[PDB]
Amino acid sequence: PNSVDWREKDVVFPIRNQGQCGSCWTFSAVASIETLIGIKEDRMIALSEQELLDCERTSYGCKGGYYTDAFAYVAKKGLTSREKYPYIFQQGQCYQKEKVVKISGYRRIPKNDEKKLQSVVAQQVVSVGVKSKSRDFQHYRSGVFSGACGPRVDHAVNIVGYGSEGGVNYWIVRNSWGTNWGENGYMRIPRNQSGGYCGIAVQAAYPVY
Template sequence: MLFLFLISILLFVPSLSSSPIPTRSEHELSLLYEGWLIKHNKSYKDSLEKEKRYTIFKDNLKYIDEHNAGNHTYSLGLNVFADLTVEEYRATYLRTMPPKEWKQGGNESDSYNLDEISGVAPDSIDWRDMGAIGPVRNQGGCFSCWAFAVLTTVEAINQIVTGDLQNTKVVSIDGYMSVRRSNEYQLMMAVANQPVAAAVEGYGQNFQLYTGGIFTQYCGTKVDHAVAIIGYGTKGGQDYWIIRNSWSDAWGESGYMRLERNINSQGGKCGIAQWPYYPIKYKNMTSKLRGVKTPATTYLS
């Protein structure tokens, strides 16, 4: 028990303010690794593979320490991906493009392009606080992030409309809508109504090893991963999105990331404003916006 307690302290490496780079003996590194293996229930086929992963683990830890020694708005840490190279992480958990249906906008019979939403959105919202978000899931390495992101939004709209989060009898929708592309204000208005599925570029060691804070690292817009936007807010003058991932609660902030919002880039941070969609359900919905019709009521009239 004491061993696990000491290991938990050693594993806590993130810091949101600048600090000296830690120096560790080989014995301390070995303890860190063994504790990390226990924490994340890791096992390997043989001792050679375990040693290979240990080398990668130490390389990642060096990168983590160097990052956390700087003055950043977010921290890196020994999360579930700490034994992967960035290339392995990319090959296992990321895809190249969003599904064809997202890019085409779907069929006219069950989807609509939403050009503008009017009204006044709240300064912040977190749909977890409204009971619309269930436990974080783990997609594994099956490239199913799109399905998990959409499922999150479908469950959420059913909870918002019916009050029931995960009753399989009511997990159904009547179509979906696309938010006006590359417009973070319109995206904020949509998220104020309900969680939204979106695509981001998740490639990079910083995204891989993220453990907390507002992610402000440079990233491109070649989207390769789907997430659900379940809220937004501001801290210390820094605007952010709250995104829900599907890599279990052993990544990020218990499965979530705060991603920089309102940046001077057309596609948004990591391309998050490029492909936003959300489901609609034909029933009067309570809107968090003042003076705006929700998609369900709009397309019933």
């Protein structure tokens, strides 16, 4: 497809806010799973970032984590709904409540491969990491981003589609900083920097239904 936008396909929930807690990895994992379930089952169910934050044991709570291992947790343990286990903006006791969704596994996209990244984005939402520690990235408002990136991949986000404006290819990037950041919470990042713009293609991964 020349363009993809899952937000226009009834499978992407509204932008959320992680607050200060470094739980971006939980928001990225949840967003990828939420859309996958919407694609595969035609069912919209909001899932719990809080369960991953409190219960996923390879990660660092509010100091960062792994959406890849979050996928493995969901495949192995299931995941409850956001209604049952809401986000409290900090890590708490790990509750194992009634689960609403599983996955079968997850796959990693080889580093720097935007062609394979695009092929997967054409089918579902993908979890990625970007270099967010920069004034330009934090204060991005609109347009296809052409500012400076952070020094290192440090912020887990999602790619929810792709397109073009004026011949400029872009990825549609879902962040968890609320709707006041970027284009109502999203960023259009150049598509096709080695590793992708702000390293978007360095560590891409996606859940397998």
